[PDB]
RNA sequence: UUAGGCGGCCACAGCGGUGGGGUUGCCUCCCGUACCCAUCCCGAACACGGAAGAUAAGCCCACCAGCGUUCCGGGGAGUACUGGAGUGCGCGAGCCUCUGGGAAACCCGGUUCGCCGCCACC
RNA sequence: AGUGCAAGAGCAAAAGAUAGCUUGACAGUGUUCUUCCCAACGAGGAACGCUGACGCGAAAGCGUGGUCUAGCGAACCAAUU
RNA sequence: CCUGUCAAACUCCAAACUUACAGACGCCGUUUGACGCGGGGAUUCCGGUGCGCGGGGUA
């Protein structure tokens, strides 16, 4: 399970690439979704590779982001432990997070919006003109690498 | 053989055994084929159908297993051929087969030929086959009369020991008569 | 092994390659059976432009008809060696060719399951000279 | 294209690899298909008759009845529904 | 006319003589020079390596070769060495010599397409590299920058 | 399948070569022209009738890789080329990095001297 | 190689050659594709059927002209069945 | 035998890639009716640029 974050806008990006992001529930810059590691999903993220940031986040980080930017399928409601417990199969955020990470369920299945609308990275990101191996912020990241981005956009 | 571009004929064309152009026209009918084949000493008659991995023979008759019914004469002649045809024709009927088309392989469509005799027999057995009566022998030759008369010009038995000296087209009737009722494997 | 390996005469072709005939008559008597026309291929300067056109005849003799012929033909020829085929044949003379081969030749001349004769079972120039020379005459 | 005949630009698709050259096996020219089956369309360079327009080489249609010995296969050209008259010689069962 | 007009390999390969007529003959006199009777049985083997894909008109090939071999007469008319220009001008070249209407040009020459790193010239010498000099003058008459490379020769 | 007939795939089956096999199930060569039939001339072939002989052909069986073919290992080669991305480089031609794919020739070593179906049959 | 003619393609117990026989280069009426990718548009063309009558073949079958893609023409008026 | 080179109208080979159909996941539709069908009304048929692949041309 990988965390996907659109870092580049729609203007000028191939249409078949944009549709893919839309099929993955991301319709705006900085929006983030969680995606299972499957053949079918793998191909998708590969096609989206140059306009996004992805990687496997740590239990903690997912928990921080879930708490800070998760939302009900509809409404303002804060997704906190209580919400999680009174609305999902799990008893608290950590429980949810773990399930997500082990790809046992999904944000929809638990009545949550498939998208974590993140905040701009505090301190800024490494650039959207180069990949990670080059000092940029595009492409696959380290678990420690994804965590920093996600945490900066917490 | 010579190079990567070389064209090697289909196996059955190499062996000079199957005429594919005739085969295709034959398969057009969508009916079973009445395979009429010969050997120096024998005559075979098969009813073949088309299959996923090759042809399927649903009924056959060999001039050898003719004796199995009382044949005591040579098996590479006209009377032999007809009977083998009738025998396979009957076994065919038993198998639920009602019609077929004559496949004579690489043999020639000569009038009064043994393959046509085979065809005549299969038809009489009850099999429905597209044919032409005046391309067939005149019954007597089918009976084996041409050979009996040939022995009339005796001086020396046409048959080395075998059976009879003046041969028997009658032995033919007795056999056809036999095949037309009861008996095992029919 | 032998008996089925020993040579034999298979057809003797006597043909008169004329260039446009009355010649058949003599071929008929010299051999004993009707001659066959010899059409030609290609249009050429020897006023021989006609494709289908009688330009000679031939006669293929088999069995006795061939021996009874060679029993006078050979005597009218001297030559031998070099003038022999690589398959054990030879032509002398009005032409008279003699095709020689061993017992299982039909395998290559029949319709069903035909097959080319194996080089080993072929007749060599030498094995040929022997057979014929051993029949009323001398080689070279 | 310099011309607009049906065989324009079909040099490749209607030519056999030197080894597949010559009369094709009869087994596939007699194959029987049932209405509803999915069949791949591909002209056999060696088989003259029963062909369809080269543009459809590659299509995968649905057998829906026949005409004579030839089959009637329904395909969809772009967004248009079309029916193609084709013999077994140029058809193959999908899967 | 300037090499500027034909030195790039941006056009499609145009070499089918069955569809092109009136192609000028090549100015290249020989491809095998020196002792062509002998085989490469020499201690040293130096090569002239082109450093960029380019098109080289038979014009330049002949001038470059002459300038090299004509100089290799620092060893003598029948000296002990063999010189080889391995490329041939296959690419036919046109010129549109009406304005841009019906502009497909008419054949005016031929050139050889050499890719960066190929060797256009190869000489064979005994420890007597005057050839190294024959090439400083050779790559002087061809468009690209070049690399003078020595192969069998650890006799430095 | 101690030899057969009809086939499917249509060279992994081709080309070439070695050895073995038949009073019989057999297939052949083979022997022979009164008949059906036949050669623009020949019972060569085709067709018909038949066993004196043979295992020499064919065919069946076992095997050989020199040539051709199929597939595989290792090397060539993650090279050539390439779908996506870049305020990376270069006067430019063009190149480079990240991402997803990925060859051909050739060399060396294996493989391949057919596989499979239906019927018939000491 | 040959297969009438460009080019490309097809074809070997043939689609080529020879021989013999025959007029299916037949009347009628369609299905489909093409012309016009997708995507509407005429004439024309082709593929594949059916009805009828025929040719050849033992027969399956083949023949809706020539192996395939060029060789074509609206309305009005005339002549013709 | 050895040795030096090529192909838009060459091919014993052969990608990336494009593409028909089917299943899966995704997304979408069943009060926002998708897919599709029928009808009304158009505008439009001077285009341009970047990038990739091009063909012509010294450019
Ligand atoms: Cl037979
Ligand atoms: Cl069509
Ligand atoms: Mg909301
Ligand atoms: Mg700030
Ligand atoms: Mg920045
Ligand atoms: Mg092409
Ligand atoms: Mg033996
Ligand atoms: Mg036609
Ligand atoms: Mg008018
Ligand atoms: Mg008129
Ligand atoms: Mg394309
Ligand atoms: Na074929
Ligand atoms: Na002008
Ligand atoms: Na230079
Ligand atoms: Na004549
Ligand atoms: Na034998
Ligand atoms: Na029309």
């Amino acid at each position: 399970m990988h965390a996907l974050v659109q870092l580049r806008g729609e203007v000028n990006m191939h249409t078949d690439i944009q549709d893919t992001l839309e099929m993955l529930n991301i319709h705006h810059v900085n929006h983030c979704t969680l995606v299972p590691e499957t053949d079918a999903y793998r191909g998708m993220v590969a096609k989206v590779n140059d306009f996004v940031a992805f990687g496997e986040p740590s239990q903690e980080t997912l928990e921080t982001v879930l708490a800070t930017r998760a939302e009900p399928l509809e409404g303002d409601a804060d997704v906190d432990d209580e919400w999680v417990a009174e609305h999902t199969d799990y008893d608290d955020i950590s429980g949810l997070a773990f399930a997500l990470l082990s790809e046992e369920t999904t944000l929809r299945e638990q009545g949550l919006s498939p998208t974590l609308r993140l905040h701009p990275p505090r301190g800024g990101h490494d650039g959207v003109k180069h990949p990670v191996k080059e000092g940029g912020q595009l492409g696959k990241h380290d678990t420690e690498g994804i965590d920093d981005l996600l945490e900066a956009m917490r | 053989a010579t190079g990567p571009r070389y064209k090697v004929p289909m196996r059955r064309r190499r062996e000079a055994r199957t005429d594919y152009h005739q085969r295709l026209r034959l398969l057009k009918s969508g009916k079973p084929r009445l395979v009429a084949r010969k050997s120096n000493k024998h005559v075979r008659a098969q009813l073949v159908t088309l299959g996923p991995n090759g042809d399927d023979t649903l009924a056959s008759a060999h001039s050898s297993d003719l004796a199995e019914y009382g044949w005591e004469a040579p098996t590479g002649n006209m009377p032999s051929a007809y009977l083998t045809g009738l025998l396979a024709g009957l076994r065919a009927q038993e198998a639920g087969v009602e019609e077929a088309v004559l496949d004579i392989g690489l043999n020639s469509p000569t009038p009064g030929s043994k393959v046509f005799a085979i065809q005549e027999g299969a038809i009489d057995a009850g099999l429905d086959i597209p044919h032409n009566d005046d391309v067939l022998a005149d019954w007597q030759r089918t009976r084996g009369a041409h050979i009996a008369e040939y022995d009339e010009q005796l001086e020396e038995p046409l048959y080395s020991g075998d059976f009879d000296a003046a041969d028997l087209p009658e032995h033919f009737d007795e056999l056809r008569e036999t095949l037309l009722d009861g008996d095992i494997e029919l | 092994f032998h008996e089925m390996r020993e040579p034999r005469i298979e057809k003797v072709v006597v043909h008169m390659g004329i260039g446009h005939a009355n010649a058949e008559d003599i071929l008929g008597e010299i051999t004993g059976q009707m001659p066959v026309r010899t059409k030609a291929k290609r249009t050429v300067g020897e006023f021989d432009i006609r494709e289908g056109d009688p330009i000679g005849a031939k006669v293929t003799l088999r069995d006795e008809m061939a021996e009874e012929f060679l029993q006078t033909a050979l005597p009218l020829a001297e030559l031998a060696t070099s003038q022999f085929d690589d398959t054990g044949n030879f032509s002398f003379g009005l032409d008279v060719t003699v095709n020689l081969v061993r017992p299982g030749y039909r395998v290559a001349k029949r319709d069903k399951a035909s097959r080319s004769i194996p080089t080993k079972h072929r007749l060599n120039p030498a094995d040929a000279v022997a057979f014929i020379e051993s029949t009323y005459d001398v080689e070279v | 294209p310099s011309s607009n005949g049906p065989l324009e630009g079909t040099r490749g698709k209607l030519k056999n690899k030197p080894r597949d050259r010559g009369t094709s096996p009869p087994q596939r020219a007699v194959e029987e298909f049932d209405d509803g089956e999915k069949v791949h369309l591909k002209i056999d360079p060696s088989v003259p008759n029963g062909r369809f327009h080269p543009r459809f080489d590659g299509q995968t249609g649905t057998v829906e009845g026949k005409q004579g010995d030839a089959y009637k296969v329904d395909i969809v050209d772009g967004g248009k529904e079309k029916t193609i008259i084709v013999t077994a010689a140029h058809l193959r069962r999908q899967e | 006319k300037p090499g500027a007009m034909y030195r790039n390999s941006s056009k499609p390969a145009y070499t089918r003589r069955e569809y092109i007529s009136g192609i000028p003959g090549k100015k290249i006199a020989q491809f095998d020079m020196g002792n062509n009777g002998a085989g490469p049985t020499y201690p040293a083997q130096v090569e002239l390596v082109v450093e960029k894909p380019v098109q080289i008109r038979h014009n330049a090939l002949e001038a470059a070769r002459v300038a090299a071999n004509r100089y290799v007469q620092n060893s003598g008319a029948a000296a002990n060495y063999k010189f080889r220009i391995r490329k041939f001008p296959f690419h036919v070249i046109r010129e549109n010599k009406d304005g841009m209407r019906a502009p497909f040009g008419k054949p005016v020459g031929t050139a050889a397409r050499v890719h960066g790193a190929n060797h256009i010239f190869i000489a064979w010498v005994n420890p007597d590299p005057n050839v190294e000099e024959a090439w400083r003058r050779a790559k002087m008459k061809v468009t690209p920058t070049i690399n003078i490379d020595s192969s069998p020769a650890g006799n430095a």
Side-chain angles (χ1 to χ4, degrees), chain D residues 5 23 25 27 32 34 36 40 47-48 62 70 80 87:
Chain D
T23 307
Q27 188 79 328
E32 296 278 307
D34 306 304
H40 295 126
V47 182
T62 297
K80 195 174 175 193
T87 56

Side-chain angles (χ1 to χ4, degrees), chain C residues 1 3-5 8 34 36-37 39 58 60 62 103-104 106-107 109-111 115 118-121:
Chain C
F1 67 101
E3 186 185 63
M4 300 303 263
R5 275 270 307 182
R8 76 179 186 194
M34 289 186 65
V36 141
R37 302 292 170 166
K39 298 175 183 173
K58 79 178 177 184
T60 60
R62 291 179 147 74
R106 162 183 176 69
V107 172
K109 290 303 175 183
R110 50 169 175 183
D111 280 351
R115 210 119 326 189
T119 61
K120 318 77 176 185
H121 197 65

Side-chain angles (χ1 to χ4, degrees), chain B residues 36-47:
Chain B
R37 291 306 148 69
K38 309 177 306 169
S39 181
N40 291 324
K41 291 189 174 185
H42 294 293
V43 143
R44 168 139 40 194
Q46 297 164 301
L47 274 211

Side-chain angles (χ1 to χ4, degrees), chain D residues 53-64:
Chain D
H53 194 295
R55 267 177 192 150
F56 307 131
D57 238 26
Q59 281 292 322
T60 296
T62 297
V63 175
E64 297 288 43

